[PDB]
Design a protein around this ligand. Sequence first.
Ligand SMILES: [Zn+2]
Ligand SMILES: [Zn+2]
Ligand SMILES: [Zn+2]
Ligand SMILES: [Zn+2]
Ligand SMILES: [Zn+2]
Ligand SMILES: [Zn+2]
Ligand SMILES: [Zn+2]
Ligand SMILES: [Zn+2]
Ligand SMILES: [Zn+2]
Ligand SMILES: [Zn+2]
Ligand SMILES: [Zn+2]
Ligand SMILES: [Zn+2]
Ligand SMILES: [Zn+2]
Ligand SMILES: [Zn+2]
Ligand SMILES: [Zn+2]
Ligand SMILES: [Zn+2]
Ligand SMILES: [Zn+2]
Ligand SMILES: [Zn+2]
Ligand SMILES: [Zn+2]
Ligand SMILES: [Zn+2]
Ligand SMILES: [Zn+2]
Ligand SMILES: [Zn+2]
Ligand SMILES: [Zn+2]
Ligand SMILES: [Zn+2]
Ligand SMILES: [Zn+2]
Ligand SMILES: [Zn+2]
Ligand SMILES: [Zn+2]
Ligand SMILES: [Zn+2]
Ligand SMILES: [Zn+2]
Ligand SMILES: [Zn+2]
Ligand SMILES: [Zn+2]
Ligand SMILES: [Zn+2]
Ligand SMILES: [Zn+2]
Ligand SMILES: [Zn+2]
Ligand SMILES: [Zn+2]
Ligand SMILES: [Zn+2]
Ligand SMILES: [Zn+2]
Ligand SMILES: [Zn+2]
Ligand SMILES: [Zn+2]
Ligand SMILES: [Zn+2]
Ligand SMILES: [Zn+2]
Ligand SMILES: [Zn+2]
Ligand SMILES: [Zn+2]
Ligand SMILES: [Zn+2]
Ligand SMILES: [Zn+2]
Lengths: 172, 172, 172, 172, 172, 172
Amino acid sequence: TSQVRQNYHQDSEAAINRQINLDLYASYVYLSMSYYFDRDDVALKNFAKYFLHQSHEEREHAEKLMKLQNQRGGRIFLQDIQKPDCDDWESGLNAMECALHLEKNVNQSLLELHKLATDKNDPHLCDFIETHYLNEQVKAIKELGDHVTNLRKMGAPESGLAEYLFDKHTLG
Amino acid sequence: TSQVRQNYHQDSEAAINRQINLDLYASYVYLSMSYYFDRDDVALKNFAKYFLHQSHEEREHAEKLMKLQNQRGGRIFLQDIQKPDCDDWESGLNAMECALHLEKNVNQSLLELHKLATDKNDPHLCDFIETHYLNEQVKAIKELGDHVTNLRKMGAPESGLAEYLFDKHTLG
Amino acid sequence: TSQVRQNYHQDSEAAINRQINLDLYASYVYLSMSYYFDRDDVALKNFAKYFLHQSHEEREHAEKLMKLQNQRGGRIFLQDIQKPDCDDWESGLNAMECALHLEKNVNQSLLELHKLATDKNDPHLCDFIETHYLNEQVKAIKELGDHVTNLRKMGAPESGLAEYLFDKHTLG
Amino acid sequence: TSQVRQNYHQDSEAAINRQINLDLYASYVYLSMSYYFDRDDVALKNFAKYFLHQSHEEREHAEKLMKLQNQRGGRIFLQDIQKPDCDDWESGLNAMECALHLEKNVNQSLLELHKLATDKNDPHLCDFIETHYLNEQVKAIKELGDHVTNLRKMGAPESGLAEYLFDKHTLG
Amino acid sequence: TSQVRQNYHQDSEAAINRQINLDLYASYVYLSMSYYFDRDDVALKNFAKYFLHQSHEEREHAEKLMKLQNQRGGRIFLQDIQKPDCDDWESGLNAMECALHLEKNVNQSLLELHKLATDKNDPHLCDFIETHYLNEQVKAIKELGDHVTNLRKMGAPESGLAEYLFDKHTLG
Amino acid sequence: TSQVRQNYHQDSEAAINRQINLDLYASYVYLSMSYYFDRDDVALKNFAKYFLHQSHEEREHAEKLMKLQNQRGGRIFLQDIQKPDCDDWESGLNAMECALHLEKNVNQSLLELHKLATDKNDPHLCDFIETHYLNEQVKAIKELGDHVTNLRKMGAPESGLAEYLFDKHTLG
Ligand SMILES: [Zn+2]
Ligand SMILES: [Zn+2]
Ligand SMILES: [Zn+2]
Ligand SMILES: [Zn+2]
Ligand SMILES: [Zn+2]
Ligand SMILES: [Zn+2]
Ligand SMILES: [Zn+2]
Ligand SMILES: [Zn+2]
Ligand SMILES: [Zn+2]
Ligand SMILES: [Zn+2]
Ligand SMILES: [Zn+2]
Ligand SMILES: [Zn+2]
Ligand SMILES: [Zn+2]
Ligand SMILES: [Zn+2]
Ligand SMILES: [Zn+2]
Ligand SMILES: [Zn+2]
Ligand SMILES: [Zn+2]
Ligand SMILES: [Zn+2]
Ligand SMILES: [Zn+2]
Ligand SMILES: [Zn+2]
Ligand SMILES: [Zn+2]
Ligand SMILES: [Zn+2]
Ligand SMILES: [Zn+2]
Ligand SMILES: [Zn+2]
Ligand SMILES: [Zn+2]
Ligand SMILES: [Zn+2]
Ligand SMILES: [Zn+2]
Ligand SMILES: [Zn+2]
Ligand SMILES: [Zn+2]
Ligand SMILES: [Zn+2]
Ligand SMILES: [Zn+2]
Ligand SMILES: [Zn+2]
Ligand SMILES: [Zn+2]
Ligand SMILES: [Zn+2]
Ligand SMILES: [Zn+2]
Ligand SMILES: [Zn+2]
Ligand SMILES: [Zn+2]
Ligand SMILES: [Zn+2]
Ligand SMILES: [Zn+2]
Ligand SMILES: [Zn+2]
Ligand SMILES: [Zn+2]
Ligand SMILES: [Zn+2]
Ligand SMILES: [Zn+2]
Ligand SMILES: [Zn+2]
Ligand SMILES: [Zn+2]
């Protein structure tokens, strides 16, 4: 037992390790999406930049969880980072829809982690998740929904003109 | 076949995808090492910072290869990022020795990629590897060897004083 | 034989003179394209500016080869600069497609020059072509492919609206 | 007929296309002269710089004529740019004498173009040639004559010392 | 075997030690030339400054090779630096001709080193020689040829006036 | 006899040539020491920097003697620069001890040169040696003795920790 450990349940420690993996996975999904938009036969540079930014942000989410694990005297155990479900992301709209789905899955995991913190009476962990994770998820989900709505209303994915103009006027 | 593709062999394309995975793997190894040094029972903050910096650099190596793949009209295929061989890295000296081994393995992969480029008469690929990868590897290997030598000569790993002072006076 | 000449094969000297002509030819193609877009019945000012910039760049490519010829003690022999294959370039998309074809032809010539340098064991010439020419070609081909893809996806050449908006939002 | 065309005779349009070619030709002559002075066995760097400057200026003359053609609703038709009459320009004095001859030939062409403009009662074209071309020619011819006179009086071409000192003290 | 050594042939290591000596030798030749021009009975201060600058540059060439040897895990073995072939360099022209000969000999050694790197499939060494040495040699040879040509054309070595004026107007 | 020569004995001239060689030799010894500390299996970067600085300084000592020779109308005669007695310098302490020995040998040579100047009633030479050489030697010897004392008292050469800490805290 770490000299620093206090009020930190083994189940919470294990859940934090699962969430570290999930955020690394999310970073990898967005990395794949980014470079899909960098292909010469897709060529939407601002979709590419947008998803690369999200990829680096997810990696920061994972590092802050790793820091948390050590702060509480837990021990980090890393697992393989699974490759994303898709190699080809089809369209800007489809990538946005996939990102929305991903963020809702990450949110569900964080809400389950918060419930575990509650159940184990770990207010420091509750506060950590609330302060640093839950509103980030709500903001991300709202932003992605807004993007999906605009792309659909503009006529994507069939209108390549729509995705081109959204790339310039929203993601620019 | 991509409209941009020219003088780019399928074997080279496949090798670039393997190297993307290897550099992501290297980023993950260094991430794990970094947070080992952040543990309360290790507590070498400059070893932690040094390995986090290397982790972010390896991720940049991988992104530049992804950019290359698309520049040449190849198609990126991502694979799982395997977890590192160790969860516990033992000591600053041991982590440095492991990093040296890793960088020599990465170098061997890059040298094999260069040989493939030569064999397929792909001077653009040869130049890319020479310019952006081979001297970075030689510099990294030299730096890690220098670190290993100093730590050994100072009395690491047995002298916790040695690793403490190296953390301050070399990695600070 | 020039007092400076060393390890410079007569075939390499002749190939450099052919490449000087090819780069001057490329400058002329882009000059013609530029002023096509300046016509009152075409009137795409940013396509015009884009191709004029490429024209001046090709002229710089040719001058640097002329400098190289003299650096190595070869003798420059100029040939006529042939007029481009087209007087009327049809559309922004068609001009981009023509430019892509041209750059791939220039690239093929440079790759053949590099192979000659290899065959004659002229590492200075190999380095000159790799450093100053081959990645410029790869970047140019990628950029033109990206432009072609966007114009096609926006609905060019039939949509004059597409070419108008690309002129403003990409080439502006 | 272009929507912009007004008072622009077909003969004037054809003459402007001939003059575009002549100015491109002049740019090529000066490019060849420039790099002759860059040879290791000639090695007069300021003669080289002087003629490269004139080469770029002639290209600007040609571009302004191309702009004029489109302004008036004429259609640009490019022709091959013939290689210069000489590969070896002999001496600084000889190159200057050749340049003087060239500029007087260009001037004769411009004076014939002005006469055509007069004959077709095209005052806009008359003004264009007078304002942008005729005094440039008179200044260029005077400058080249001055250079020829100095080089002759200093003892060129036989005195390599003369050409060396003129390169430093006049063209520097 | 050094912990850093990888893909570094013993023949390459030995060749790098020979080249270190050759560059030190070149530094010594130029040091001797410099102070010849500082003699009261020669008294060409800018020839003296020019050759002292080249002497210090050759020493930097040698130090960068020493750095390379250690980077690759080779071991530096120094040899005597032989005195130059001449004590008296005769004239500015003769010194320039001697320097041209020296630089072509150094170039031949570097080209042989590059060929060895190729033969031993050492792309890092190939890149090192190409990037840091081969174009420096081509530039140096071209500059010295240009100087020789000017001095000859001005009437050196018989014209002390020529060497005086070149010292002021070229080397100043 | 040089037009400038006055009160300058042939023996003094010969002694100045011997001292030029000795200072070049000293520059070479320190160059060798510097790069020994740059080896991956030694890796003391501040010892390396310290000895490289001394190497460049000795070269300046030699150049100032060459200037002196010409100032007085003597003639410089260069000799081979002998390779140092050691390839491997063993330790920081051993290198410092070797440097101390070298500087005392250089000092003995300078004191003998001063005695010769006295014997030949050459006060300009006496002043040159006193002003520019003798106190530099006394300062260098004192500094090296101080370094030797500290390294010995810290426990070098057996304590690699000692040499590491001296590298940081004294030579940093
Ligand atoms: Zn963000
Ligand atoms: Zn996240
Ligand atoms: Zn980070
Ligand atoms: Zn898997
Ligand atoms: Zn997220
Ligand atoms: Zn709470
Ligand atoms: Zn709560
Ligand atoms: Zn709160
Ligand atoms: Zn770094
Ligand atoms: Zn890497
Ligand atoms: Zn990045
Ligand atoms: Zn696994
Ligand atoms: Zn690495
Ligand atoms: Zn290559
Ligand atoms: Zn190669
Ligand atoms: Zn450009
Ligand atoms: Zn080009
Ligand atoms: Zn130019
Ligand atoms: Zn033709
Ligand atoms: Zn091009
Ligand atoms: Zn090469
Ligand atoms: Zn090559
Ligand atoms: Zn290169
Ligand atoms: Zn001008
Ligand atoms: Zn003109
Ligand atoms: Zn222009
Ligand atoms: Zn012709
Ligand atoms: Zn003109
Ligand atoms: Zn008028
Ligand atoms: Zn008129
Ligand atoms: Zn220089
Ligand atoms: Zn050199
Ligand atoms: Zn140096
Ligand atoms: Zn000898
Ligand atoms: Zn050199
Ligand atoms: Zn190579
Ligand atoms: Zn090579
Ligand atoms: Zn000093
Ligand atoms: Zn000294
Ligand atoms: Zn100096
Ligand atoms: Zn010897
Ligand atoms: Zn000394
Ligand atoms: Zn005295
Ligand atoms: Zn005295
Ligand atoms: Zn300290």
